[PDB]
Point group: C3
Chain length 216, copies 3
Amino acid sequence: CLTGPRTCKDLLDRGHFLSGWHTIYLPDCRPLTVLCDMDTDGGGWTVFQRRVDGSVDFYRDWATYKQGFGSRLGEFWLGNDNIHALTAQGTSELRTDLVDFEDNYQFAKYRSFKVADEAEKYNLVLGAFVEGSAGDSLTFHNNQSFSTKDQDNDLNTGNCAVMFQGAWWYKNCHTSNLNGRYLRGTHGSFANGINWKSGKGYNYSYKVSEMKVRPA
Amino acid sequence: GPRTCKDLLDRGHFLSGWHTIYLPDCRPLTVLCDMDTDGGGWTVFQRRVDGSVDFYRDWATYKQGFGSRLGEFWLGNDNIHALELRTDLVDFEDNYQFAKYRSFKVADEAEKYNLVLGAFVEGSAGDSLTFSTKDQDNDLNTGNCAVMFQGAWWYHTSNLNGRYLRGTHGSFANGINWKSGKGYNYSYKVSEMKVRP
Amino acid sequence: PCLTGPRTCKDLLDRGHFLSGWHTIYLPDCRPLTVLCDMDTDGGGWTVFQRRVDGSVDFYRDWATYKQGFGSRLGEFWLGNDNIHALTAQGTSELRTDLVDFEDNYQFAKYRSFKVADEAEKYNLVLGAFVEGSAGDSLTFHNNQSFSTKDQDNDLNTGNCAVMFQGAWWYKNCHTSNLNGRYLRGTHGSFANGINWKSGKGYNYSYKVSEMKVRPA
Ligand SMILES: *[C@@H]1O[C@H](CO[C@@H]2O[C@@H](C)[C@@H](O)[C@@H](O)[C@@H]2O)[C@@H](O[C@@H]2O[C@H](CO)[C@@H](O[C@@H]3O[C@H](CO[C@H]4O[C@H](CO)[C@@H](O)[C@H](O)[C@@H]4O)[C@@H](O)[C@H](O)[C@@H]3O)[C@H](O)[C@H]2NC(C)=O)[C@H](O)[C@H]1NC(C)=O
Ligand SMILES: [Ca+2]
Ligand SMILES: [Ca+2]
């Protein structure tokens, strides 16, 4: 542990050049098998969310988002407890990678990203937007509690997670909804897909979504 | 150490994927755990997904197991013996169906891996299950079956080790078929057979 | 660890690992390397160093990237020229190339020995006799050539083969195989810039699956 890899970036520095699932040791020494992206933007990113085919249901409850769900073989959410543990020491960059159904790639990159602990409802703490073809659709959500269908912490009199079939740091309501429904390209329905407002908008659900972190 | 995928789930392993468990005799085995289906903690012993793996194999091959962690496999008759049953099915339009049985077991090679099933509990895919290889004649129905329907099974109304024919096919009952599901002329996109304490 | 660990995928097969998948082996210098073992094909025990299956990975990469390796354990990859040299530098490894088209037809080629030289020798291909194979022999043509990438032209053409055929290979003047070419999905009108094996499906058909793999012989 004290001499073991603590991030995907550590692994890259130690000559692990292929993306895939590797064990790392969290700050408290807990081992955790995580997906490393060793290619994108210099490589060494720890991936905490992945959408690619709609095989996994993301419309899930608080407990499920807390612990994590999905499959190493495809789509997953790494889990709110784990994402907190990964980001708690304050200085990881965030990258969001998005691909549409014509294989057009867009991204957003943020200077810092953290979620707080469960007691603080996994509050989003987001640093400055640095750049990205996808534009900034996350700053809007800064300093907001995470919400799921069964724990509404949003700023709407109704339930955002239900209204947009997802789980997110909803306010009233969103400009991004990456845990929304896998609706496959253009959809008439308003904003309930894998949507990034400044990217492809409220009526286009991406083919691929990945959210990932790396020591700044 | 963990003895089942249910044990791994209990220990905080929440994502499906390959994990090592310890069989009743302490022999380590890396198995696929389904942590997301129906409560989770299932050990998957058969999987079809892309037709990348040849399932028309002989006795020794089904005995020891074959395929790939990257996709399709048969965990192996020796392993499956050492280890409720659920069958999960998906068509090329991404429609999900399933079955479920109260008990499931296979005997050793002396018993020639005789199937010891149980009661059909439920399942949208319906009931089509209530061992023979191409080089081991054991069929129920006289003559041959494995060679006839190009698979390996307890020879049928189901044929999950059949050919990956990809959806509707003209040939008869020789694909990944489940009578009560899509019939003898439709081969599933995805098939999985899994167990749990 | 290295004292008792497997040194090849063949060792793993012998120890009772019957499913293909990623396993750690120990290189001749004790360096551990997680490699993909093919335990299914032709007796099993093969170490896979190249895999194409879905076009998710860009193979049009520079010398540095080919040297260290790139791609994903989840699908497509090039294990890396330094690793391939390490794996084949000593003893005799045979080579098998497995190819699948989009109509489910499987072809292969098998070679008696296969070695890539070190970086100073530009990862020179040292290939033994063609043994057999439904894909025909489209690699002997490339024996005793340097590896070339878009940024490192070591080929025998007055132009840049890597750029012209959008890949990285032991290009001559220029090629009969191009398995690191673009994932063009079957028939393509562009000339010889896909995952092509001339004696197999020709210069205008890019395979669905390509695997290159080695085993002690
Ligand atoms: C592999 O191919 C090389 C040439 O190809 C280059 O090197 C290889 C390793 C790859 O990296 C390729 O990409 C390169 O393009 C062959 O080398 C030639 O071999 C022939 C004999 O088969 C040599 O011809 C002889 O030359 C003798 C003089 O040798 C010295 O002087 C020459 C220049 O005249 C010089 O080139 C050579 O290296 C020596 O310094 C001569 O006495 C004799 O009569 C005969 O003609 C030829 O010179 C070599 N060329 C080169 C460029 O070295 C390898 O033999 C071949 N190996 C195998 C296993 O087939
Ligand atoms: Ca509300
Ligand atoms: Ca040239």
